[PDB]
Ligand binder design. Structure first.
Ligand code: CL
Lengths: 286, 285
């Protein structure tokens, strides 16, 4: 029921949530002109947002202003599965012969990231990074250098957009999104040194020189965790949720509300520094 | 989700590729130069390698550069028709702050699925200007089909749907159920019968760079342009009944595209049939 969904969201926020009200709530959280902010969104948690994703994006642009930048994690919803080489031989041949290349302009973001990354990447002037598995998108003053030349291998590591967010003094905003959605902690996993690090190898079709070619990629296991967190994390619990919870308890990050959405704003450099130290201390046992 | 893939892969007995869809579309009767409005239920096709992009590429492969694809978009985040029933403070917030419809960025209705949202993002795609029932089109006839969508009676004469009929266009249901045929709203707008139901609603648009509120009139495309209670059996959707009767009268062809039950109609005889069906069932002189 469409009617119903609207009724519940209106009730949740006690009426429509507007662009200027979101702008006000974001400034109260600590977002300021000139910031670069990567943001994860659970749109319905805000309430009934008058104008949907476009209103959230324009409120964010109002706060950071023309010299600031917004960033999201996109990925590729219709990528071939990592394990597509475990299918009957005629099937995977069909994939290898006919699966289209990743295309930054048209390939849709992963559906699990919700509507906001797919709205951001389609904004006029938005820039989407070239990686077929873990592309980001950005909008604003620093968007070309942040997204430029996404490193094929180790795409969460030293050369990556996430590293550039840290070096810029950027921020991470969870906008109703839960603590485990903080993508930036994959950059922490990529930097962290501890035994038992998990890596993945997969292939995906990309377009280079205007022709479609397959490429093999290496990354940390950003799906099941770059380590076994068995010893440091109660089972049933998500490692990133535990790290961010400890982060917050150590005084890194500010919590508040944007509409009806429980929201958290972090500086990216201390969050990554905390995350790598968390992983190395819990997992090295020296 | 690996089981999700196993379900889809079992449904189509392996990946459905661009070439396989093109093959099945041609066998259903789509030809080079066709203009085709299509409604899609991706999961009914099976495991489509490449998702919506692959469906669109296959359709372009069949109709070629002289052909045109059309979809219905609408506007997912339009103000609800009845926001003017809300408490005064809530409707004043919508009036002062709801952003204008923007054909380049306003999202299609979530219920229309992922194909319309992918089509309108293609390079060269054209999206009509109507804030409530916009269409999008891609190909040689897209500018003329989408141009100057009438504000009032947006399914009536001179609308994109009327232009699809006049062009000799077609309608494709690609695993979509018989009741998503948008073209039959054009039949409802043309049909002469008692008790026709209309809606009047307000939506923000941009006119010469300024955001303005406008009032719009349409047939009730949400609840049905007529009370169909005496014309259809209980629990059946009117458009499904009309399309079923259309098929049984020899209008339209049916087959499979991948695993998806699919139906292809010529738009001019579909609308003529739909108008007659409504006038015969709802006048009963
Ligand atoms: Cl490049």
């Amino acid at each position: 029921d469409d009617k119903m969904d609207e009724t519940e969201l209106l009730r949740r926020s006690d009426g429509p949530v507007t662009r200027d009200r979101i702008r006000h709530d974001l400034a109260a959280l600590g977002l300021v002109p000139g910031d670069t902010v990567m943001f994860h969104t659970r749109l319905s948690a805000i309430g009934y947002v008058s104008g949907g994703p476009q209103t959230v994006i324009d409120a964010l642009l109002d706060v950071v202003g023309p010299t600031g930048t917004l960033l999201v994690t996109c990925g590729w919803n219709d990528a071939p599965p990592y394990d597509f080489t475990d299918w009957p031989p005629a099937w995977q041949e069909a994939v290898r012969a006919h699966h289209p290349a990743f295309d930054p302009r048209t390939s849709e973001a992963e559906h699990a990231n919700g509507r906001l990354p797919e709205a951001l990447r389609r904004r006029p002037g938005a820039v989407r990074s070239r990686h077929p598995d873990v592309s980001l998108a950005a909008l604003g003053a620093s968007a070309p250098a942040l997204m430029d030349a996404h490193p094929w291998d180790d795409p969460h590591g030293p050369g990556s957009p996430l590293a550039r967010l840290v070096a810029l003094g950027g921020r991470v905003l969870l906008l109703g999104a839960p603590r485990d959605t903080m993508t930036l902690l994959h950059h922490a996993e990529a930097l962290a040194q501890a035994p038992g690090k998990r890596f993945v190898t997969y292939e995906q079709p990309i377009e280079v020189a205007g022709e479609r070619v397959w490429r093999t990629f290496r990354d940390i296991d950003s799906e099941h965790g770059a380590f076994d967190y068995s010893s440091a994390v109660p089972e049933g619990q998500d490692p990133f949720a535990v790290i961010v919870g400890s982060m917050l308890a150590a005084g890194i990050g500010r919590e508040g509300f944007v509409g009806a959405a429980r929201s958290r704003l972090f500086d990216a450099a201390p969050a990554v520094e905390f995350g790598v130290r968390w992983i190395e201390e819990h997992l090295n046992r020296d």
